[PDB]
Amino acid sequence: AATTVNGGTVHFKGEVVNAACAVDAGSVDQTVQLGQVRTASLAQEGATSSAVGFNIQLNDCDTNVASKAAVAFLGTAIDAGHTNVLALQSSAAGSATNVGVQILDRTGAALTLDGATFSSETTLNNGTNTIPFQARYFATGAATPGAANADATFKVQYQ
Amino acid sequence: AATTVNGGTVHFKGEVVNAACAVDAGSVDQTVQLGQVRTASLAQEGATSSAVGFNIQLNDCDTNVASKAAVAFLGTAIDAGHTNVLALQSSAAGSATNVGVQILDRTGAALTLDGATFSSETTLNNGTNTIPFQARYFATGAATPGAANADATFKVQYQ
Amino acid sequence: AATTVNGGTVHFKGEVVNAACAVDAGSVDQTVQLGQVRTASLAQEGATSSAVGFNIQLNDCDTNVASKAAVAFLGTAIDAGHTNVLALQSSAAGSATNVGVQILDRTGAALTLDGATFSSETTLNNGTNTIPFQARYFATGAATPGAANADATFKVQYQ
Amino acid sequence: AATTVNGGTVHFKGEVVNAACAVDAGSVDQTVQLGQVRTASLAQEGATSSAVGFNIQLNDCDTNVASKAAVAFLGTAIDAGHTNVLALQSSAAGSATNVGVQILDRTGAALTLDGATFSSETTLNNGTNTIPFQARYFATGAATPGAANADATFKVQYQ
Amino acid sequence: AATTVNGGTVHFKGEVVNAACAVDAGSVDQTVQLGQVRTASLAQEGATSSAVGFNIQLNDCDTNVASKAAVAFLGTAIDAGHTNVLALQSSAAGSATNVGVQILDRTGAALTLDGATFSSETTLNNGTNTIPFQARYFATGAATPGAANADATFKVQYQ
Amino acid sequence: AATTVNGGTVHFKGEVVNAACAVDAGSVDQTVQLGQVRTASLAQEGATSSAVGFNIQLNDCDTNVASKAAVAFLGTAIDAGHTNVLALQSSAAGSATNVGVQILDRTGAALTLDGATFSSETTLNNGTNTIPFQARYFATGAATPGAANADATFKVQYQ
Structure with a gap:
């Protein structure tokens, strides 16, 4: 008789922005899988494979x-100096070596994962705007087998 | 030869209740994303946007x-007095201003995030009962750009 | 020489029930699209459009x-009090207003999305039984343009 | 004027391997549904139902x-000793009892979900190789109604 | 001009072991939720509910x-003598009574949460080995409503 | 009647900096797990394993x-002279031997955990800047099994 208990939990994920553009609910998070990359294929200093679309x-x-x-990407460097390419996830004993994912800006040139790297001339129109970007596999030298997982955050600037 | 090491860790999350209703394993935690809300759109004293379903x-x-x-929600007030609306996450230097998420009770009227606010006449039947609730964006005045993240805990009462 | 790697992943979705009825593999998940509904058409307090079959x-x-x-449906309320109609998906900044999908029980009367609402006299025969249900558009007042997506879970009771 | 906000998020899922075989992007994750299994049908010590193909x-x-x-599968034991059969998902109060999914190796004999259980003589050819596997329902004794969900990870070895 | 400040913090979690097996980065910590258990259902001296898989x-x-x-589990006793079952979290004024989570060893028999209880004949193969384990709800007598949360640590022995 | 008691406690963690960059609320503390490293694998004088990304x-x-x-890292030396590698946590009777985590600067060369070691040419742009860094396993000679946990503090300099 009269029993008060905690049902469950609800995560309210949101973000306030300007009156220029607003990301869709199901567009906030997107799953992009590159696949399994062969070391022999990415065993060259500065090797690039197929670029994924999203x-x-x-x-x-x-x-x-x-x-x-403007557009920018948030990530890590594959080999420090190569900040243009993303780094491994966090598997110190299960990740890859000199293997990552490069980010290409729709502006035409390749962008570097720095976060505040807003270097693109994207045209904003009235409606549902969309920011295109590519992401291929990049090797710093001798690709190794293991894990090639990572994550990046999208960035938008209204002017 | 003979090496004892710690494999990993297992989190056993559970909760005991009455013989009236029991939340599902994958139902315990639910991810609800509101999306990106424009300030200009929520720049009115008591403005309300689209209400999410869950x-x-x-x-x-x-x-x-x-x-x-009975049903209730656990959260924070958007602007103190407005305890009906949820507050920002915890980004003092990255959150929004006067922007939150209101909670509407299935009873018909809007509920306030107080925790022990059980004011609903939910009918309990034999089977898999479910508690509906809405959550739209609520502005206390002049919406600001930044972060509009938060969390709420579900509550159920058996009588 | 000798390289061990993770191929892919396999999701084993299943559910154990009684010896009365068993949902088909390709019948477990069904895609039902209502389509694009006009606000002007659903701008009436308690408006109903064409009902989809499935x-x-x-x-x-x-x-x-x-x-x-017995049969039941799991969903959310369109406008809290109107638990008979489903609610929006989760687009706080891209969904609709006062627009949802009502569920009609094969029993003859309209059912409410509560989950444990098993109020139907379905006859179980020897073979491949099937549960019919309708789902039309329901407006609580002034329909708005945006997103009218949602989901529901089917429920069956053997006696 | 000049507003910097976070667009969305991009999950870069990848994995580096050898120059012998590489899983396809859309092949990485596969959804295999067994369906609803009757307890009475799986109420025998060591009962087996139809085997799914994938x-x-x-x-x-x-x-x-x-x-x-070589090929292997990663999963859990249905009843501890029966490591050949997969176990329930994680619904302590909604799962099944003595009900799981067995894995059959293309080698001919049934394999056990151990992860490092690579016991298959798969022939690797030049092109798009594929690893076949079956997965039927397995009962340890008296099947129970509830949840029969689980997951497994595919494994490949190049020699 | 020239401002030195502390950016953030990085937690480097790791553990050195033998050349027999190594837990994955994302495998180190696993979230297993049992769900909401009814007292009436677990109001029997030595009652057991559905067992979760992981x-x-x-x-x-x-x-x-x-x-x-070898395999072992680290936890607490539900009712002292019943060291086979895990105990509550730490909510002296919000936990449950005589309610816990039992641990079943893949060896076939049920294991006791003692930590150094390595009693299993697990076969170690070349590749990615995995240790299966079950965890159902266990009552020492009269189950009570409240909190049924706890934690356990995995253990592995190489021979 | 009229009872004054202490509710709980609130930890207000913050830090004032310049108008060049500000760490995010949920970015202040990050959990990076290296995983389980094998001694045999790190039993070489100056051995390096997979580098984690963050x-x-x-x-x-x-x-x-x-x-x-500028960027810098705060930590301890693995073997005194090797200040480039981090040291064990604090388990004198449960830690590892000659095993630690090295820190690689995005500048290209490997940095040493000294705290005031600001040797990087990071470009600061208008928006949400991010500092990339790698951290692999480093052995000073003969790796030992036990604990390989540690912590590091991030450092940023505005010029």
Whole structure:
């Protein structure tokens, strides 16, 4: 008779921005799988494999508010100096060696995973704008077998 | 020869309740994303956006044991007085301003995030009962860009 | 020479039940699309549009074991009080307003998305039984443009 | 004017291997549903139901590099001793009893979910090799109604 | 001009072992939820509910180094004498009564949470070995509503 | 009637810096797990295993204020002279021997855990800058089994 208990838990994930563009609910998080890459194939100093395609959906956009648009990516360096390529996940005893995922900016040139690296001339129109980006496999030298997992955060700037 | 080492770790999350309703294993924790909300859109004193939908699954329920059912939500106030709306996560230098997520009770009226606020006439039947709830964006005045993340805990009462 | 790597992943989805009815492998998950609904068309307090048709296939059924059969649906309320209608997906900044999908029980009367709402006199025969159900668009008042996506879980009771 | 916000998130899932075989992007994760199994049907000590079929696609394969090929599966034991059969998901209050999914190796004999159980003579050819495997329902005694969900990880060895 | 400040913090969690088996980075910590258990259901002296399934991934394994393998679990006793069952978390005013989680060894028989209780004949093969284990709800008598949370540490022995 | 008691406790963790970069709330503390490392694998004088990837998020950054950026790490020496590698946690009777975690600077060369070792040419842009860093396993000679846990503090300099 009269029993108070905790049902479950609800995670309210959200983020406030400007009146220029807003990422979709199911667009916030996207799963992009590169696949299994062979070491022999990526055993060259500066080797590049097929580039995966993916774009972040962003509905609710205006043109009078913001005309210009910038893009950036948040990640880690594959081999320190090579900040253009992403690094392994966190498997010190199960990851790969000199193997990562490079990020190409829609601007035309390859971007570097720095976070605040906003160097793109994206056009913002009235509707559901979308930011395209590529991500291929990049080797710093001798690719090794193991784990080639990682993560990146998308960035948008309204001007 | 003969090496004893610690494999890994196992988190045993559980909770004992009454013989009226029991939350499902994969129903215990649910990820609900509101998305990116524009300040200009939520720049009104008492502004409300689209309300997200979500229900907590609860299998194993009886009718002779408990007929009535109460529901409540655990969270924080957006602007103190507005305890009906949830508050920001914890980013003092990256969160939003006057922006939160309101909780609507299935009873019909809007509920306030107080925890012990059990004001709902939910009918408990024999089977897998479920508690519906909505959660839209609520502005206390001038919405600001940044972070609009938060969390809430579900509550159930058997009578 | 001798390289051990992780091929892929296999998700084994299953569920044990009684010897009365068993859902088919390809019948477990069904994709039902309502389509694009106009606000002006659903801008009435308690408006209803065309009802979609769909039935869950369930082979392997007995008659001596269970003669009676109950049915229920798991979902969320469109406007709290209106628990009979489903709610939006989770797009706080891209969903609709006062727009949802109602569920009609094969029993004749409209059922409410509560989960444990088993109120149907379904006849269980020897063979491949199937549970019919309808789902039309329901407006609580002034329909709004955006997203009208949601999900529901089917429920069966053997007696 | 000039507003920097976080767009979304991108999950870069990958894995480096040898120059013998590489799993396809859409082949990495496969959804295999067994369906609803009746207790009465699996209420025998060592009962087996229909076996589901599924094979992991693996393009980019060589023959001069690796001629032999091994296969293994990662999972849990249904009843401890019965490590050959998979166990329930994690629903302590919603799962089944003595009900699981057995794994059959393409080698001919049934394999046990141990992870490092590589006991198969798979032939590696030049092209897109594929590893076949079956998975039927296995009862340790008296099957119970509830949840029969689980997961397994595929394993490949190049020699 | 020239400002030195502390960025953040990095927790380097690791553990050195033998050349027989090594737990994966993301396998080190695993989240296993039992769910909500009803008192009436666990109100019997020595009552047992559904057993959850879970296995600790351990890549990098050899066969010539270690052939035999032992397993153990670290936890607390539910009711002192019943060291086979885990105890509550630490909520003296919010936990349950006579309610815990039992641990079943893959060896076939049920193991007791003692830590150094290595009584299993696990076979170590070349590749990614995995240790299966079950964990159901165990009542010492009259189950009570509240909190049924706890934790356990995995243990492995190479011989 | 009228009872004054202490509810709980709230830890207010914060840090004031310059107008060049500010670490995120959930970015302040990051959990990086290396995993289980085999002694035989790290039984070489100056052995290095897979390097883990991780970057500290830092939103709110300016370009006119600070253009150059320095980075440093705070930790202990694995074997005194080897200040480039981190040392064990504090388990004098449960830690490892000659086993630690090296830190690689994004500048390209490997950095030493000294704290005030700011030797990196990081570019500061307008937005959410991020500092990448790697951390692999480093052996001073004969690796031993036990504990390989440690901690490091991130450092940033604005110029």
